[model samples]
Target: APLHLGKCNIAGWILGNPECESLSTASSWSYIVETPSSDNGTCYPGDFIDYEELREQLSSVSSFERFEIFPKTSSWPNHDSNKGVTAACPHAGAKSFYKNLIWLVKKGNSYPKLSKSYINDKGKEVLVLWGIHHPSTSADQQSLYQNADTYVFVGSSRYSKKFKPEIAIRPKVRGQEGRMNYYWTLVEPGDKITFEATGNLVVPRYAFAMER
Candidate 1:
């Protein structure tokens, strides 16, 4: 019913479209990023945003800690880089492929050939580069329609049931209104709709002003 989610596969499911049958095919591939603890992690300002200060503030193992960085074109080069996953988001066409591709990767499944790569602190497994504004200092953004909002689905994978990718402009907070709360929705490859906000919202500098 929302503008962003308009006509997405899930909409058909709610309308009782036979396509809903496919929703049942989703497996358990869908999931939220979580640690052994109940918390995902904490967020803080990045290096330029006081990297050391952020580290000191969130030294405890509580939540996904992050360092907020300034916004700039070069802060995050890949913000405009395309790693392929643009075949489905025809809505954006060829003009802004990376931005659109970033949206799709935010879904977080496993694009295999697409999802951009980064290394963890330990240089362990490859990590998906989410909201990293190359020129800016921030590198931990992962939410939908936030201040600098962007999203990307890893790949098409079944979670509890068949699912697909979708975007929704939900509410900003518990009671905020007259405003938009954009979201990156994700589900199994064939599901109509199910898990949304599976990842974090990519907020822009403007949205961050609201908190200040």
Candidate 2:
């Protein structure tokens, strides 16, 4: 079964509820809870901590979640290096559903080719694979206009060695592109599968899941 995640509500403020009245107004509950503030100088203002603490108090959070902005430059606001601060309340119990069965594999390369072994001695028969290219990096978006393509190949060892990938994905030649590729198949004990990629500009990240 596919896992489902839980949701929390702050009275009328919820992440997925579009019909709630809070969706329209600036003073609504979501604006108060989800919005971020920026420090106006080279250092986080003393009041920033107080503001976060008050938001935590009002939102029933013991501590605020923190995230660093991308681009890693002073020009980009709300970054740790710039003495900037950003805060958000933790979801009441929301955790990634994939955390249980899926895990990331660190094969850093432009054309990463990898293999896997499925030991299903106990009758488990399902295997699911998921992959993404720099899932959280926006820096690559600047090079979207560059000629590039992405591909995925899956097969047995012999077939993988003899076969050439005919399927190429070039859906976007200019705009933002390249996110995820999900594939699944059934296998028995001692089964082997291969995964290969190409035409990606940077080293990509990947994950695999065994579901039964």
Candidate 3:
């Protein structure tokens, strides 16, 4: 059975009536909620971020049921410095065979490749895996030109949705967390690594709110 996360005030959608007027707040109704990652969020300095800050950075989230932003940074000369791409292998008992890259699972926290096999299957020998989200309003619209809140990685052939959600939920964040970051699904080729976005004005949140 799908996990039933509690309803979140923002971004809630009625499974039955898409045309029903959107409620400003979750009514007495019990709707399923979907938070993207399964790991409990670690405590952080209050100033670094919070629910408010997250909404502030991504205004669209103000009314969102759930939201997440994955940032992208240049690889460190020693991948060991990054968690998403690290040399430490939990099963290997030593650093990964690919030493040029200091890879980490904690760093990427979303999609961390634990073994050479995972890397071999998902990445090129010389490259690391990177995953980013560019959700826009239109599924068919070109997304490379759009601005994204989350840019989770910099790895080889990495734009796959290997970690995204597979089940039907009211509002789940979606996907598998990586050794370094999280993954949406199967590893994708670099050349095919384009953007998977929805667009703006058409963000699903507004579907029920606007009246004709």
Candidate 4:
């Protein structure tokens, strides 16, 4: 079952034939909902992004979504991001059913591998495991969240979804309590180490994320 956890806290995993039927509820692993928002936004005025290149990834989301833009000081418009889509919708929904990467794990082919690790201020160290997303030849088309939000799960990999992380590390943000940030999965750690190795392997349950 999906456990109610503090954001970025380690999550657990279950591997088996029966577990397939266990994830029947849509409320686990993946989910989305809305609160409120600004008007349907296009590129943020000065961002001259090529929206056409992202057509396939955009699906039909263009109608009710806001185009999130990276500012002038960001590395996004660097002309070398090589990212197919730069501007994107902040709305919490499926960008492209055809493109959002699939989250899968199996044993026959290969399994997760030890990657980077993270240590808590308590000096707790955790080993990480990662697998690679396939069709790895060229870059993947950008999903909806180009610059709006990070997509992660809490487990092992360095909160990076690209690595097909075995331990999906979901993120936590802390700021003004009642502001727009409240919609996030908040946690209280207030420290930073980013990597350590071994011992602190955690649990594996599934849960949903609700975004504003």
lDDT of 3 at 83: 28
Off by over 4 Å in 3: 1-48, 61-74, 79-212
Candidate 2 residue lDDT tens string, 39-122: 111010111122333333334322222111111333112111221111211123332212111212223222233333333343
In order, candidate lDDTs are 0.23, 0.26, 0.23, 0.20
RMSD of each: 20.7, 17.6, 19.5, 20.0
Which ranges in model 1 have alpha carbons more than 4 Å from their true place?
1-75, 78-115, 121-151, 155-165, 169-212
Candidate 4 lDDT by residue in tens digits, 6-74 = 211121111111101232233332212211212112111111123233222222221121111112123
Worst 10 residues of 1 by lDDT: 203-212
Top candidate on TM-score is 2
**Candidate 1 structure quality by residue, lDDT tens digits, 1-212:** 11122222322221112212222222222222212211111111111223234223223222221222223333233232123222212222432112211332232322222222211232111111122221121232223222233333333232122222223333322221112112222222222321222233232211000000
lDDT, candidate 3, residue 58? 28
What TM-score would candidate 1 get against the native?
Answer: 0.19
Q: For candidate 3, give the lDDT.
A: 0.23
Off by over 4 Å in 2: 1-112, 116-119, 132-150, 156-178, 199-212
Q: Per-residue lDDT for 123-190 in model 3, tens only?
A: 32111222222222222112321322222222235433322311112221322121122112222322
Q: Which regions in candidate 4 have their CA more than 4 angstroms from the true location? A: 1-79, 86-133, 136-189, 193-212
Residue 199 of model 2 has an lDDT of: 29
Question: What local lDDT does model 1 show for residue 79?
Answer: 36
Better of 1 and 3 by TM-score: 1
